[PDB]
Each structure stands twice: as structure tokens, then as C-alpha cells.
Write an enzyme that holds these catalytic residues in place. Sequence first.
Site, PDB file in Angstrom:
ATOM      1  N   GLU A  49      42.192 -49.017  -2.662  1.00  0.00           N
ATOM      2  CA  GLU A  49      42.884 -47.881  -1.983  1.00  0.00           C
ATOM      3  C   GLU A  49      43.368 -48.198  -0.539  1.00  0.00           C
ATOM      4  OE1 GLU A  49      43.905 -44.706  -2.979  1.00  0.00           O
ATOM      5  OE2 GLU A  49      43.801 -45.539  -5.010  1.00  0.00           O
ATOM      6  N   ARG A  50      43.731 -47.225   0.310  1.00  0.00           N
ATOM      7  CA  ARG A  50      44.231 -47.492   1.685  1.00  0.00           C
ATOM      8  C   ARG A  50      43.145 -47.974   2.649  1.00  0.00           C
ATOM      9  NH1 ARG A  50      46.473 -42.613  -0.045  1.00  0.00           N
ATOM     10  NH2 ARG A  50      48.669 -42.462  -0.153  1.00  0.00           N
ATOM     11  N   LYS A  68      43.268 -35.820  -4.653  1.00  0.00           N
ATOM     12  CA  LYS A  68      42.037 -36.533  -5.028  1.00  0.00           C
ATOM     13  C   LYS A  68      41.191 -36.932  -3.825  1.00  0.00           C
ATOM     14  CE  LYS A  68      44.285 -39.758  -7.151  1.00  0.00           C
ATOM     15  NZ  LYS A  68      45.660 -39.284  -6.838  1.00  0.00           N
TER      16      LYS A  68
HETATM   17  N1  LIG Z   1      43.430 -28.575   0.066  1.00  0.00           N
HETATM   18  C1  LIG Z   1      44.642 -28.869   0.522  1.00  0.00           C
HETATM   19  N2  LIG Z   1      45.236 -28.017   1.386  1.00  0.00           N
HETATM   20  C2  LIG Z   1      46.458 -28.313   1.842  1.00  0.00           C
HETATM   21  N3  LIG Z   1      47.226 -29.359   1.564  1.00  0.00           N
HETATM   22  C3  LIG Z   1      46.614 -30.187   0.704  1.00  0.00           C
HETATM   23  C4  LIG Z   1      45.361 -30.020   0.153  1.00  0.00           C
HETATM   24  N4  LIG Z   1      45.062 -31.076  -0.693  1.00  0.00           N
HETATM   25  C5  LIG Z   1      46.112 -31.850  -0.632  1.00  0.00           C
HETATM   26  N5  LIG Z   1      47.103 -31.354   0.174  1.00  0.00           N
HETATM   27  C6  LIG Z   1      48.379 -31.971   0.503  1.00  0.00           C
HETATM   28  O1  LIG Z   1      48.651 -33.023  -0.398  1.00  0.00           O
HETATM   29  C7  LIG Z   1      48.682 -34.285   0.316  1.00  0.00           C
HETATM   30  C8  LIG Z   1      48.153 -35.395  -0.560  1.00  0.00           C
HETATM   31  O2  LIG Z   1      46.737 -35.197  -0.781  1.00  0.00           O
HETATM   32  P1  LIG Z   1      45.787 -36.434  -1.132  1.00  0.00           P
HETATM   33  O3  LIG Z   1      44.398 -35.951  -1.325  1.00  0.00           O
HETATM   34  O4  LIG Z   1      46.012 -37.534  -0.157  1.00  0.00           O
HETATM   35  O5  LIG Z   1      46.372 -36.864  -2.551  1.00  0.00           O
HETATM   36  P2  LIG Z   1      45.955 -37.981  -3.609  1.00  0.00           P
HETATM   37  O6  LIG Z   1      44.726 -38.601  -3.056  1.00  0.00           O
HETATM   38  O7  LIG Z   1      45.712 -37.270  -4.889  1.00  0.00           O
HETATM   39  O8  LIG Z   1      47.095 -38.921  -3.679  1.00  0.00           O
HETATM   40  C9  LIG Z   1      47.898 -33.989   1.599  1.00  0.00           C
HETATM   41  O9  LIG Z   1      48.196 -34.905   2.643  1.00  0.00           O
HETATM   42  C10 LIG Z   1      48.381 -32.571   1.903  1.00  0.00           C
HETATM   43  O10 LIG Z   1      49.673 -32.521   2.459  1.00  0.00           O
HETATM   44 MG   LIG Z   2      44.959 -39.713  -0.498  1.00  0.00          MG
END
Ligand SMILES: Nc1ncnc2c1ncn2[C@@H]1O[C@H](COP(=O)(O)OP(=O)(O)O)[C@@H](O)[C@H]1O
Ligand SMILES: [Mg+2]
Lengths: 456, 109, 177, 79
Positions: free
Chosen positions: A179-180, A153
Site C-alpha cells: 500500500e502507500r 477501506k
Molecule cells: N467516512 C467518510 N466520510 C467522508 N468522506 C469519506 C469517508 N470515507 C471515505 N471518504 C472519502 O473517500 C476518500 C477515499 O477513502 P479511502 O478510505 O482512502 O478509500 P480506499 O482506501 O477504499 O481507497 C477519502 O479521502 C474521502 O474523501
Molecule cells: Mg486509502
Amino acid sequence: SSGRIVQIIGAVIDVEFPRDAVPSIYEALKVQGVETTLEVQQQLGDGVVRSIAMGSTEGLKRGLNVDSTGAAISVPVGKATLGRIMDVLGNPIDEAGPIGEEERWGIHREAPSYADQAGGNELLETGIKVIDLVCPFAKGGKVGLFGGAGVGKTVNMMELIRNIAIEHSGYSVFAGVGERTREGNDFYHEMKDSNVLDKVALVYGQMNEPPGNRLRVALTGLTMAEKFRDEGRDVLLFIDNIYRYTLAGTEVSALLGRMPSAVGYQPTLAEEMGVLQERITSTKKGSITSIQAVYVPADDLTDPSPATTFAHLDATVVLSRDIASLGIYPAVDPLDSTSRQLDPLVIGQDHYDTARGVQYVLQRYKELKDIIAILGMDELSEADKLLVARARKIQRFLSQPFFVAEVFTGSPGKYVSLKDTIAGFKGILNGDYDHLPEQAFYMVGGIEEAVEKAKK
Amino acid sequence: SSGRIVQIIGAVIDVEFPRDAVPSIYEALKVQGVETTLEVQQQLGDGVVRSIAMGSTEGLKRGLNVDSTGAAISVPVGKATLGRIMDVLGNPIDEAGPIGEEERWGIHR
Amino acid sequence: AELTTLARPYAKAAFEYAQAHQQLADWSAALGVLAAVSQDDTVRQLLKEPQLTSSAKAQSLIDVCGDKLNAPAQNFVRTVAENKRLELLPTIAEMYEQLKAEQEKSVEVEVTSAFTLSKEQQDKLAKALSARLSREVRLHASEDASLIGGVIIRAGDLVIDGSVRGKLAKLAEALKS
Amino acid sequence: EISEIIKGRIEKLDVASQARNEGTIVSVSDGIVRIYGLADVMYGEMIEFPGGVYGMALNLEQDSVGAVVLGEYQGLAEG
Ligand SMILES: Nc1ncnc2c1ncn2[C@@H]1O[C@H](COP(=O)(O)OP(=O)(O)O)[C@@H](O)[C@H]1O
Ligand SMILES: [Mg+2]
């Protein structure tokens, strides 16, 4: 006049006032010895009012004096908010001094009337293949990014913030709701170093904050976006997580004396969501394009909060943990994701038929999963074998390396136009690429790069 | 001092004591004239304690006298317990006479 | 549950005993003394203590009132204390007077006007209300400068408004709606 | 209005004054304690009980204080 604290339970405080001086619903109050702000939620009778604290309640006691301010929480609005960071009460939190405000607006307002609504259908290109194909966005419309923990997200939102700012020339408003704190620091310095900061207003109420802050930060950011819309501008309104506004409401609901509804949610869940969501709209004066991340509790899309949010959006992008597990990023699900702009009268027949063709192939592949798991691919008909081979290529071609994801892998980011997106999927559906290997479509941007990757 | 039964609802019994003699949580109580032991679970206030009966409540009535023992359920311990069958209160359920105990210990620590 | 819901059994029992024994005026005085005495800052504190028994709270309240409580009224205070209801004494007195007023076919009517009205006008309003309601009317006349002219009558839950402020409000709503 | 003879009787009553920093236990149940009279206690404040036991103030109501015991509650009693 003034009142006296009579009861304290967590974030909720009861205050007694003289019968001729009882404060109004949503009116802001201030505690005399600590200057802590309280927002009135309801009038209990006998001069007693119930309120939520806009800060920590540790150290407060019964009998302290409370002052009524005569108005709701009021925040600064206009040009003075651009390139500045503010809290829920409109105070600056960036150490850059006071805000040079010309006026302040109360955070509580009614939604624009039925006669003020705008009928916009102008297509917005995102440069991301899966979104531009099955989830086309529109200027002045609302987008929602649904997903469980750690699926994409924030990464997919940071990539959209990068791509939409290429064509947009106006202002932006970003509201950080529960959030963070590290991610707010990373985003502020990134824009400051990139010189983008002077066109963005930043509001924060992160996870470290008490329930009252997390409950009202969304209203503070939206109040700044409504000032710019009402000035006749086209603005972008970005929300770090709209679910946190509802959750902050659940933490406080039992303390407000309300009977719980299904799975412990507040009885007012749909009304609290509608009162905020209806203000986030484009009008005949100006436009608000809005993008929001939606947390999905325990990966359950049927949960009351996510289930109640779908009806408030023009485009719905559904992220999946099963897709993310295969390596595909962005982890979007073409069969669950949809948009109001996916219409032959809006996008033309060529785009519409390509998108419908991709969904038909992916749906048929999903029906064969159990048969393929027990007996393998070799038992399928000559027609199903060809369709499964194209489904596997389509599923891999939907992947795309992002300019914000470069730190995770090393690969350079790719921007793909709508023309290149339609041409690639149309060719795979027609069978123009039946000879290339399945791994040539994984992480390659445009269709021509799949042809070059197959040479290795 | 002694208390009085104020309420009986199945195995749950409420007993009222003078304000200066309220029994402690987990204390063992004895009903006068009946072989019924009560363990205190909660102090409700107003001199009233909520307790659970360690046997059948049939035939009990409101107003019966109850005596505090000064300690938790205290059971016989040591060599004398070997080769014997006992209930939760440490009474010899086998028809082999009294246990030749030299010491008794409370069950909560 | 409202305080009126909890005080109803007690006010009704006190009223029926007072009525059957021809003591309506004695209980009216006794309940009024208990309502006032239990609201005193020192007595209010004494009644809330967690270490005192119901009988100790009752005896302390009876010793303070003394001369004003007959044997039946003392028995009633000991009954209210045993059931832990001493906080309802002001509501019990209020509900007892409502049962008494309705029995004695009496109505207390509040009246407000822009500026003072003569005894001739008060007696004209009194006969009109007594003829409409079929009860003895006690007009508690008063003035309120918020009214532009005329008078407002409040006979319990029934309200009769003949004031100019009410007519101006009807016009504002008629034009705004 | 209360009479001067009754007001004199009220001034003679045995009513115990309690310091604003002190309270009396009303009830004990599963590690949660209810206290009467801690007039100046703050939300999140440490409450001191006999035998070295401490509590934390969580519910500040009109008539009583609700506290969670920071150890073993079985040694705590009403009064
Ligand atoms: N487009 C992407 N390419 C590679 N890894 C990704 C990608 N999107 C997410 N990830 C992986 O998933 C992890 C969590 O993504 P994040 O956006 O922080 O999740 P959310 O916000 O949904 O909790 C990232 O730190 C990475 O390791
Ligand atoms: Mg995140």
C-alpha cells in the site's frame, strides 16, 4: 556448499548447486557480492533451483556465487518487536538501532490442527451503527472490508483501530502489504505522539517494493502475531490489504513456469490463500482477532480473488461506490454485508428482529427503483409509499461522522452504543419518527440527535 | 546475393539467405521467373527471414530463387502519378502504359 | 520433452543399421567417441556458435574424430547436425548401449554392502540373479558404511534390499504411522 | 577417456575466443532482439549496437540475452 546464478528474468532467479548440496524449498540464499536474499520456490532438477529475490535484481549478472543459509527466512519475535518498524526480512527500518531479540522464528509454518480450534462467540462492540446492527463482530474472529478504489477501506480501518483499542489491553500486530508509504508514516507518527506505539509491532512492504517483498510481508507480520498468541495472549492482527499478497503471486506466476488460469490468475490462487488464511486463527492457547482490507478489482465482486476470500471470514463488510456517491459514509451495503454472529442464540431476539426488519425494508425499496425512476414515487400504493419513506430514513440513519474523518469535513466524531443503535432503528421501523424530515437522520450519531436536528 | 524459399504457409513465406547477405526488415524481394514481390517482416536467425507476399502464393514451390532489391517497396512519385490508377507496388493497373516517372521513393520513413 | 524423448529416433536408427550389418561393436566405439569429444570445453563452445553452418559444425567434429568414424558413422553425424541435434550425442550413445545390452541379453547390476564380501558370495549372488532374470549379470560391487549390515542389489529399475538399514527404517515407519 | 591424438587435433581447431563484454545478434522481431555471448552483462544494463542504437537487457538465459531496443530497431540485423 555454494552455487552459481545461471538465469535472471525480472524478480525470478535460477541458481545451480552441486548435486549433493541442493537447497530445500523455502530455504533462504544470499548472493556473495551484493548480499541480496533469495527464497527457493522449486527444484528444477540437475542441481538447479528457482528462487524469488527479496530485493531489486538491477545490477545482478550470470555466474555470481550464491550461499545457502540452511534455513528459511527467520524474523525476530516477542516483546522486543513492540514499538519498532521492520521490513520483510525482519531488519529494523525506523533508524532506532538493532532489535533486542531473544529468539527468531522461520516465516513458514503449518496451520493449527483441527483439535486446537476455539469456539468463541463473545460479541465485540465497534461503536459504528451499521456494523454493530447487521455485521456484529466477535472476539477472536476474522473480519474483511471489501471495496473498490477510493471508497473507504483505509478510513473505515483507521476508525476501527481507534475504537477497538478502548476495551482491548493486550498487544497488536500491523502488516502493511503493498500500500502507500505515506500512510505508514502518518500512522507511525500518530501512535508515537499519542503514546500508543509501545503496544504495537509494525511490519512494512509497500507499493514501492519488488514482488518478493510484497509476497512475503504478510507471513512476517503473522509470524509475530503467532508468537504472542502462543504465549497465551489475546492479540489483534491488522492487514493493510490481503489482496496484494495474491497479486504479488500473479506477477511472478508466469516466471515460475506455471500455466495461467481464468482472467490470468495463478493456478495456485485458492491454495496460496488457504495456506496464509488458516494460520490467522484463535486456538485453545490464545486468541487472534483479525481485520483485513480487501481491494475489489474494477468494482467486480465476482473476480476470482475477492470471490475466493469470502469463505475465510466470520464477518463480511461490503462497501459500495453507489452508496458513497449519495454522500453516506461509511459506504456499507446492508444487503450484501453479513456476519456469523447475526443469530438469535448469539445476539438475542430484539437485535436479530431489528436487523431483519431493516434488511426487509431496504430490499423492498431496491425492487421499486426502476418504477420510481420512470414514473416517480406518486404512482406507488399507500403501503409502498410509507415503506419507501421509512427506507429513505433508515438509509440516512446508517451514516455516522467518524473521529478520523474530522479532517475531511470539520464535523466532530460520534461513538454509538449497541443499545442506542437498536433503539433508533426499532423506532423508525415502528413509525415513532414518521413526522421528522428525511435530512434530520443524515450524519447524527444517536437517535436523540435526529430529534434535535429536526428543530432547524 | 540471392535466397531460396524454405517454407510456404498461405501468404507467409520463409526465405533462407547466405549469412553475409541477409536482407533488412521491410526490404522488397522479387521471386525469380514469377511476378511476386515479398516484404521482409522479421529475421528469425540461421540466415532465415519471414516475409509476406504482395500477391497470390498459388503455384510457388520450395527452392525457387529470390532476389533482394536493396530497398523497401519503392514507388513512382511526382507529376506523372496524376490521373493514373496504381496498385500497392506502384504498378499501373489502368491499361494506359508505363508511368512517365523521373524518381522513386521507398514507402517507409 | 526429456532428452531421452529427442534421442530415441536417432539411437534406434543407429542400432538397427549396426545390427543388420553386424557392426554392433564399431558403432559402440564411434558413438562413445562422439559423446566424449562433444563434451570437451573447446568443442562444446565451437558447436554453440551462431555464425557456423550445420555442415561446418559436422565437418569439424568428423575431422577431430577421424580414424574412429567409418563412412556410415560420418553420414550419421552429418544427419544429426542437419536436424540441429548435436547436443544429444551423449544421450544417443547412452540409449544405443541400452538397446545393445537388451539385445545381447546382458544386465549390469550395482551392489552395495556395509563391508566387503568374498568372491564366493559374489558368484552366489550372480547365479541367483541370472536364474531369476534369465540374463547375463555383471556385478559392480562396492561398499557404503551407511549400511549397518547386509547388502542391496540394484538390477536397473528392480531393487532387492536385504540390508539392516532398510529393516530399521521399516521399524521407524511402523512405530511412527 | 579421449585419446592423446584426438586431444592434439582438438587443440588445433579453429575456435574463436569471444570477450565477456561482446556479443552477436541471433534474431530481430518487433523491437525485441536476441543476442549470443554477452557473458558479463547485468540485468537492466544498456547494450550498445552499431549506428548509435541502444538496447536494455531484460532476459538473461543460459544460452542467450533478450533485449528491448531503446529507439528504432529496423536498422538492426542478424550477425
Ligand atoms: N467516512 C467518510 N466520510 C467522508 N468522506 C469519506 C469517508 N470515507 C471515505 N471518504 C472519502 O473517500 C476518500 C477515499 O477513502 P479511502 O478510505 O482512502 O478509500 P480506499 O482506501 O477504499 O481507497 C477519502 O479521502 C474521502 O474523501
Ligand atoms: Mg486509502
